[PDB]
Amino acid sequence: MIRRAPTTLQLSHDDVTSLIDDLNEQKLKQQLNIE
Amino acid sequence: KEIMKNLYKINLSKYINTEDITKSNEILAKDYKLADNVDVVRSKVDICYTQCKFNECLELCETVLENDEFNTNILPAYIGCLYELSNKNKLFLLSHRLAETFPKSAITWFSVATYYMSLDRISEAQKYYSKSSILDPSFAAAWLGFAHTYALEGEQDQALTAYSTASRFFPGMHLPKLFLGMQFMAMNSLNLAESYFVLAYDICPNDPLVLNE
């Protein structure tokens, strides 16, 4: 019988934007600490 | 009756009480030299198909098909296993020979549609699954492939009715309902998908598709 191709999860744009933002404040954290 | 009971026991469904089917297979293999029988081979191929052992499917069915290449009982499992392995040359040869052998059978047109699906040409598979479905009302493969062609085409509204129609003509077969639940997943309607997945899993406790879904 024709088995369906299983659905595949996709890396959304929203979560990767959230992570890139979090990294920006992450690097912004110690730059003032260094100063 | 000592042999007739086992021969009849061979042909029931494979999902449940699988181990007894295997034991009967070896029972037939001993003391009756019926290991070369075609129907024993069909039972083993369907057994391997239930557990998705597609490589063992291909090897055994290639051994049996060399003797006889047009056994309509055998062919659907072989086409399914070919599409799983995703090889187009063997499917193309078999489909084009079957087209010129049995023009009025639905199996050959179903095979042509499967070849196009291995080639990802959804538009021709639409028509060539419709033809096979029209030719044989009792050919569930045609409905599932037809709804798959809708789903892979891009539109899903018609595929919804297609999978529902496939489910209604064949009560008791989990797989059309499972495919319909995946389409509900594709449409982000999980409430019905919960019940549909549960009903499909009621009879398929161990298979990759159900657990993955």
> What level of helicity do the residues of chain A show?
55-70%
Task: Tally the beta strands of chain A.
Answer: 0
Specify the overall morphology of chain B: globular
Distance from N terminus to C terminus of chain B (CA atoms, Å) equals 44 Å
Number of helices of chain B: 13
Task: Tell me about the largest β-sheet of chain A.
Answer: none
Order of helices and strands of chain B: HHHHHHHHHHHHH
Q: Could you tell me the strand content of chain B as a percent range? A: under 5%
What portion of residues of chain B is helical? over 70%
PDB class: cell cycle
Keywords: ubiqutiniation, D-box
Entry title: S. cerevisiae apo unphosphorylated APC/C.
Chain A: Anaphase-promoting complex subunit CDC26
Structure in words:
The structure is cut from a larger assembly and holds chains A (35 residues) and B (213 residues). In chain A, 63% of the residues lie in helices and 0% in strands. Chain A is an all-alpha fold and 35 residues long. Chain B is 72% helix and 0% strand. Chain B is built from 13 helices and no strands. Chain B has helices spanning 4-10, 18-29, 38-50, 54-67, 75-85, 88-101, 106-118, 122-135, 141-153, 157-169, 174-186, 190-201, 208-212. In chain B, helix 3 (38-50) runs antiparallel to helix 4, helix 6 runs antiparallel to helix 7 and helix 10 (157-169) packs antiparallel against helix 11. Chain B is globular, with a radius of gyration of 18 Å. Chain B starts with a helix and ends with a helix. The interface between A and B is medium-sized, with 7 and 22 residues.
What order do the helices and strands come in, and which of them pair?
The structure is cut from a larger assembly and holds chains A (35 residues) and B (213 residues).
Chain A: H1 13-34
Chain B: H1 4-10, H2 18-29, H3 38-50, H4 54-67, H5 75-85, H6 88-101, H7 106-118, H8 122-135, H9 141-153, H10 157-169, H11 174-186, H12 190-201, H13 208-212
Helix pairs in contact in B: 1-2, 2-3, 3-4, 4-5, 5-7, 6-7, 7-8, 7-9, 8-9, 9-10, 10-11, 11-12
